Amino acid sequence: EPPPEPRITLKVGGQPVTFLVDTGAQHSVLTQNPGPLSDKSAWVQGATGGKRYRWTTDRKVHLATGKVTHSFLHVPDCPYPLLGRDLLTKLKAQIHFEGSGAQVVGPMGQPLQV
Amino acid sequence: EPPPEPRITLKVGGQPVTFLVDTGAQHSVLTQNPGPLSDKSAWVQGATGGKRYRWTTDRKVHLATGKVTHSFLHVPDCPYPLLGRDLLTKLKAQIHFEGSGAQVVGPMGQPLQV
Numbered sequence A, B: 001e002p003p004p005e006p007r008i009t010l011k012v013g014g015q016p017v018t019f020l021v022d023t024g025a026q027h028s029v030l031t032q033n034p035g036p037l038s039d040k041s042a043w044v045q046g047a048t049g050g051k052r053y054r055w056t057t058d059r060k061v062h063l064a065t066g067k068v069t070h071s072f073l074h075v076p077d078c079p080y081p082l083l084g085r086d087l088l089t090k091l092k093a094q095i096h097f098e099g100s101g102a103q104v105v106g107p108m109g110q111p112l113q114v
C-alpha cells in the first residue's frame, strides 16, 4: 500500500495523502478516492505507454511553505499517489539520499518528516 | 534535446549519458542503443500500465566515488534515460528545488565531482 522513500504526507482537501516524491513526474497524481473530478483531461506519457486521464477539481494542499490550490491527475493505473515537479517547485523541497533511504527537507533546511 | 531538470550527465560504458534524475524510478533506465543485453528481464510498472523490459549486462558507470558496475533496464518506451533510486543511493545524492529549476549535488552539497 504505502510508497517507498522518498515519501511525504500532505493534507489534500482535508484528507491525508501519502505521496511518493517523484522528480520524474511532471504533474502530481492521485490514485484512489481522488474526490470530485473535472470535465477536463490530459494525455499522460508513462514509461510503458500513454493514456488519457482526468484532472480533479481544485484542492487545497497544505505545503510546509504555505497552503496553495492544486489540481491533480486521477491515474487509477498508477501504483500510488505521486508528488511531482509541479508541487516540488512550490515546496522548494530538498531530497537527501542517506543510508538505504531518503528524506525530504524544506527550503529552510527543516526536516519534513522522520 | 535534454531531459527536464533535475538532470545529470554520467559516463556509462565509457560515454556520457544525460539522465532525468528520477526519485520515482526504482531502477535506472537507458532507452536507446543500450549495448549487450542480459537474458534477464524485470516487470516495470509505469503510471499507465506495466510490461517487461530487458536488463543490460554490466556497465562501468563513473560516479563521484569513481567507478561502479551497474545494470540498467532498457526501456525504449521511455523518452529519456532515468537515474533512479538505485544510483541516487550509491551517489548519496541530494536534489534541490529551492534554487531556480532543480539541481543535483553530492552528499556534501558539491555539484557532482563525477
Ligand SMILES: CC(C)CN(C[C@@H](O)[C@H](Cc1ccccc1)NC(=O)O[C@H]1CCOC1)S(=O)(=O)c1ccc(N)cc1
Pocket: A022, A023, A024, A025, A026, A027, A028, A029, A044, A045, A046, A047, A048, A073, A078, A079, A080, A082, A084, B022, B023, B024, B025, B026, B027, B028, B029, B044, B045, B046, B047, B073, B078, B079, B082, B084
Ligand atoms: C510511475 C512511477 C511510480 C514510476 N515511473 C517513474 C516516473 O517518475 C515516470 C518517468 C517518466 C518520465 C517521462 C516519461 C515517461 C516516464 N514519470 C511519469 O510517468 O510521469 C507521469 C506521471 C504523472 O506525470 C506524468 S516509471 O517510469 O514508470 C518507472 C518504473 C520503474 C522503473 N524501474 C523505472 C521507471
